[PDB]
Amino acid sequence: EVQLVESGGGLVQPGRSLRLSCAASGFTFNDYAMHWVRQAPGKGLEWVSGISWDSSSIGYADSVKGRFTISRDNAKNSLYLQMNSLRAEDMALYYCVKGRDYYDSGGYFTVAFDIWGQGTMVTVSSASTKGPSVFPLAPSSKSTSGGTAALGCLVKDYFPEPVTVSWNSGALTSGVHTFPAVLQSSGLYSLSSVVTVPSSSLGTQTYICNVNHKPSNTKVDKKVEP
Amino acid sequence: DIQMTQSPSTLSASVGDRVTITCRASQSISRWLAWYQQKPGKVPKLLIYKASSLESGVPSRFSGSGSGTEFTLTISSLQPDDFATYYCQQYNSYSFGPGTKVDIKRTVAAPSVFIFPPSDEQLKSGTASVVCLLNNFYPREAKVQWKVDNALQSGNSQESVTEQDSKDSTYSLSSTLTLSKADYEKVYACEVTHQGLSSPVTKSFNR
């Protein structure tokens, strides 16, 4: 299976550096141009940089020229982006992306930009890494309607993104709404994750939320009840 | 450089409608155009390359056309799961268009309104969060006010909204009232307005 696994994203002061990496597998890495593409929160896709199979040609968007350096190590099937003098505009999700085959000039049997890495987050900020507090949203008379109750978890005061939330270790997906994070004036993120379930199941089932905030090495399970 | 533009920037349309999204290049790029679908929280997915070639295993309701300067992506019969932002891209120097965000039109559906007071656990550390939940409504537009002992609030609440549900095309919405433990020792009410409710609705609790 054809894959691009990214790493090296994280939190860095304005003016400082980070190196992204991307490990390729399931295809002949040596034969392909490779690219970086980014997406700032709630905005569009922006092509950032590309590099030929043998590194003999390299391209940059005007907004990164002189600050970013793309490179590759074909012996290690790896693509890198060295980012220096990081600023606000560079805060984004960064995608590793598979380009054109060297041999197929016209793309008569090959298509470019078909395989994307999962993304890695770059946060540019002087603020501190902080784990979330995880509070229950308890089901009650005031969170019920006919045959359904709503319950949840409040995941408050973390920096930077992201945080993930599951219910009962993935065994409960149906009826889950995990809300997008919002920035609180204080400069920290917060979100809720809720789920609606049969009201009669409150007696038979246990509902636990699994919160993971990798940047702070915080894992928390919270059981939530009437 | 080559500038890519798209129109309209957003559109809403019913299940079964024919939708047409337009992409434009500042200068001629022949058939060197690609189209991407991005669902929120997921990586972009290539739908069309070389203006009209369908990428493998992409449903046949998607089609592309154009050569030169003007391009279209057509969804012949829109489905609930086609909710996304669609980006064109010039296939020579890799630059993207700004995207068209497609929403699914469906029948009006009034929200279910639930309220949650602060947890005991939280209260302990001197902060209180009241959460009001609007569940499974359409359309996305809504109004939530906070009242405390009848006093209407300002600036001390933040809202968040989910993406369209891919089965039933509804939205849900959280409003979170933030107050100190101090201030919270002082009947808390979430009031909601929406096209589906004949008149506004208020969920509240005491203490």
Residue numbers in the entry:
A (entry chain H): 1 to 52, 52A, 53 to 82, 82A, 82B, 82C, 83 to 100, 100A, ...
B (entry chain L): 1 to 186, 189 to 209
What does the primary publication say about this deposited structure?
In our unbound Fab 3D6 structure, CDR-H3 is mostly disordered, suggesting some intrinsic flexibility, however, primary sequence analysis using DEPICTER19 does not identify a region of intrinsic disorder. Of note, this loop was ordered in the previously reported unbound structure of Fab 3D620, allowing for additional comparative analysis. For 3D6, the CDR-H3 undergoes considerable conformational change suggestive of an induced-fit mechanism of binding to the PID. Residues S100A, G100B, S100C, and Y100D from the CDR-H3 loop are disordered in the unbound state. Upon binding to the PID, residues 100B to 100 F extend to form a β-hairpin in the bound structure. The CDR-H3 loop moves 2.5 Å toward the CDR-H2 loop wedging the PID into a pocket generated by the FR2 C’ β-strand. This movement breaks the π-π stacking interaction between the aromatic rings of VL residue W32 and VH residue F100E to accommodate PID residue K601. In the case of the anti-PID antibody response, the Fab 3D6 structures presented here support the notion that these non-neutralizing antibodies can rapidly arise from germline B-cell receptor (BCR) configurations and bind to gp41 spikes using preformed paratopes.
The principal target of these antibodies is the primary immunodominant region (PID) on the gp41 fusion protein. The PID is an amphipathic 15-amino-acid region that separates the two heptad-repeat domains found in the post-fusion conformation of gp41. Cluster I anti-gp41 antibodies, including patient-derived 3D6, 7B2, and F240, bind to the HIV-1 PID region (HXB2 isolate residues: 596–610). 3D6 has a near-germline configuration, and F240 and 7B2 represent anti-PID antibodies that have undergone affinity maturation.
